[PDB]
Amino acid sequence: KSKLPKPVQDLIKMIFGDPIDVNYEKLKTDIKVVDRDSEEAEIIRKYVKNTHATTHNAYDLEVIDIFKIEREGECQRYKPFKQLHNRRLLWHGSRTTNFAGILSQGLRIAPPEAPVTGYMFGKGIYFADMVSKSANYCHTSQGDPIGLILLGEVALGNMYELKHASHISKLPKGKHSVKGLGKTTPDPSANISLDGVDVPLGTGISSGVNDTSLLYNEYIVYDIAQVNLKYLLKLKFNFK
Numbered sequence: 745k746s747k748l749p750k751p752v753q754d755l756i757k758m759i760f761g762d763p764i765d766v767n768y769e770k771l772k773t774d775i776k777v778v779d780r781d782s783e784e785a786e787i788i789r790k791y792v793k794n795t796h797a798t799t800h801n802a803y804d805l806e807v808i809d810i811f812k813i814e815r816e817g818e819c820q821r822y823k824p825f826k827q828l829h830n831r832r833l834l835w836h837g838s839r840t841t842n843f844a845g846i847l848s849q850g851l852r853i854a855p856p857e858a859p860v861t862g863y864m865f866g867k868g869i870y871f872a873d874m875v876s877k878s879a880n881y882c883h884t885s886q887g888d889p890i891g892l893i894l895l896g897e898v899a900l901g902n903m904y905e906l907k908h909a910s911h912i913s914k915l916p917k918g919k920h921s922v923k924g925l926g927k928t929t930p931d932p933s934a935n936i937s938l939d940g941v942d943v944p945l946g947t948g949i950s951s952g953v954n955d956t957s958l959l960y961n962e963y964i965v966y967d968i969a970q971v972n973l974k975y976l977l978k979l980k981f982n983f984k
């Protein structure tokens with residue numbers, strides 16, 4: 745029998761579809777349950793509440809569990825970016841069947857053999873500031889309505905801000921990331937800081953950007969070391 749807390753046991757069962765504690769160790773990730781009552785949990789629930797897009801109206805989201813995560817070796821990998829400016833807490837969704845690999849190997853760039861279809865700025869690691877934009881990538885359904893989503897600290901630095909698809913060969917000198925500019929953005933006046941990381945949990949407003957292909961922002965880094973995975977949420981999708 746497992747010596748892990750029940751919510752972690754349930755997470756492992758979800759990810760692996762060996763004993764629980766053996767499957768836990770395969771993730772090479774410290775997983776802690778975040779207390780419901782805590783400042784962190786309050787902030788995260790607000791981020792989920794406030795950044796569900798109006799056009800993503802097929803479902804609403806309920807947070808079941810919040811986990812704080814620390815991948816083995818992450819501290820030393822992220823160190824060269826830990827002091828870069830413009831570090832933001834951003835969403836990344838993925839199918840549940842991908843999470844064993846994501847936690848054990850981290851988020852990775854798609855290999856050459858994968859289609860570039862779906863990647864408007866070329867292969868990289870993609871994030872949203874609107875929970876629903878990322879939650880769509882969980883590919884949940886009425887029959888399978890529980891999904892997993894990440895919050896990563898992403899070291900964005902100087903952003904190369906684009907409005908139309910462009911598979912850039914290289915970042916311009918002095919740039920660290922790409923930001924796709926959407927028509928709607930979390931209200932920047934509502935940004936808060938959590939442990940030195942900016943959290944854009946404002947309700948969506950018009951960005952005032954015209955001549956753009958994107959409804960909502962997206963953020964791309966091209967070096968896996970610019971990501972520090974921080975939280976993993978188990979979400980209930982309530983389909984309408």
Ligand SMILES: NC(=O)c1cccc2c(O)c(Cc3ccc(C(=O)N4CCN(c5ncccn5)CC4)cc3)oc12
Binds near residue numbers: 864877
């Ligand atoms: N995932 C997000 O939260 C996200 C956020 C904002 C913009 C995009 C945006 O344009 C994408 C692109 C995207 C493009 C292609 C795929 C895609 O098809 N993928 C294949 C499956 N996959 C995977 N398989 C095995 C191991 C690990 N991963 C994940 C990738 C998935 C997503 O994802 C976004």
